Amino acid sequence: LPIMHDSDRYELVKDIGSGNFGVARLMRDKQSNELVAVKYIERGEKIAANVKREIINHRSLRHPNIVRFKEVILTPTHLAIVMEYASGGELFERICNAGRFSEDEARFFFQQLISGVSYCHAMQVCHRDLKLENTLLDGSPAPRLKICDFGYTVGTPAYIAPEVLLKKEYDGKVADVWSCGVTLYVMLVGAYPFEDPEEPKNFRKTIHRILNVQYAIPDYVHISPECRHLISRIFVADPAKRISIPEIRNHEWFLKNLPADLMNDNTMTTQFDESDQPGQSIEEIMQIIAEATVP
């Protein structure tokens, strides 16, 4: 990792190398007070077109449930890519610590999940790039879900829709619904839907159950019919018959206690100001990117 820089606007919090941000540096923005994660790319090295487009595409995503891009900084050594850091650990860990969530708590997170995924579907041009298994939580005492859309260890096949395993072509949006259903199930049950109950992680057995949409909610987990219905409309092997995101938004289970401030960062209890963010112009960013090609 390069030496600390811009210590006038950022404080060094901790250098890490494990997680959704991978080898990164945690810092705290002294002006905005936001915790961020800085990723470094060697100058004139991977400063390819792919990096350029990932930054540009990601910059446009401004939803409270998606890990935001903050800014790019040139150091005399690497390109610094700064982004929001989710410090609450993985959604999955919270589920494990609780054993399983109640219906109400699962709904609270599922609402956020759907709002975020729906926003990605509208903003992104080519889809098929959502890693819901590694969804994170922010550090707030009232957990906000954070989807990670970037990449500058693979998990359960349960998350992989049947058509993603078999068919050569598929609609990424419909596959994402399957993934959200897997997340919902795990929240409500405390284990994955198609994997062998617990002890064995037999990928051969999991795949087999996935393709045959073989799942069973255990007897001790009491679920409302609305909820149960929603699950049955998501775990459908045929993609053309799988409920869509907009239909999930109109489902009775999803509509109960739907907070009005789902898409807002700044609310009555949560502070956020876009003008405190280092909102660089796309021209400014491109300047730094090209200027970063010079070693």
Q: Is 129 a catalytic residue?
A: yes
Tell which residue, 17, 74, 16, 69, has the closest CA to residue 47: 74
- The one catalytic residue among 8, 15, 129, 149: 129
The CB density around residue 95, as the number of other CB atoms within 10 Å, is 21
* The token pair that represents 259 in the structure block: 């907070």
- The answer to whether the annotation marks 281 as part of a ligand binding site is no
- The answer to whether the annotation marks 22 as part of a ligand binding site is yes
If DSSP codes are grouped into helix, strand and coil, which group holds residue 84?
strand
CA–CA separation, 228 and 7 (whole Å): 52
Residues 6+ apart with CB under 8 A from 115: 63, 65, 262, 263
Residue carrying structure tokens 């992104």: 124
Chain center to CA of 24: 17
Cβ atoms of residues 187 and 95 within 8 Å: yes
CA–CA separation, 293 and 74 (whole Å): 10
- The answer to whether the annotation marks 24 as part of a ligand binding site is yes
Cβ atoms of residues 58 and 280 within 8 Å: no
- The answer to whether the annotation marks 212 as part of a ligand binding site is no
- The answer to whether the annotation marks 231 as part of a ligand binding site is no
The CB density around residue 192, as the number of other CB atoms within 10 Å, is 23
- The answer to whether the annotation marks 19 as part of a ligand binding site is yes
- The answer to whether the annotation marks 109 as part of a ligand binding site is no
Chain center to CA of 22: 15
Tell me which DSSP letter residue 171 carries: -
In degrees and rounded to multiples of 5, residue 137 shows phi and psi of: -115, 150
- The answer to whether the annotation marks 89 as part of a ligand binding site is no
- The answer to whether the annotation marks 39 as part of a ligand binding site is yes
Greatest Cα-to-Cα distance within the chain, rounded to the nearest angstrom = 62
If DSSP codes are grouped into helix, strand and coil, which group holds residue 28?
strand
Q: Which residues are catalytic?
A: 129
Q: Which residues are annotated as a binding site for ATP?
A: 16-24, 39
Residues making up the binding site? 16-24, 39
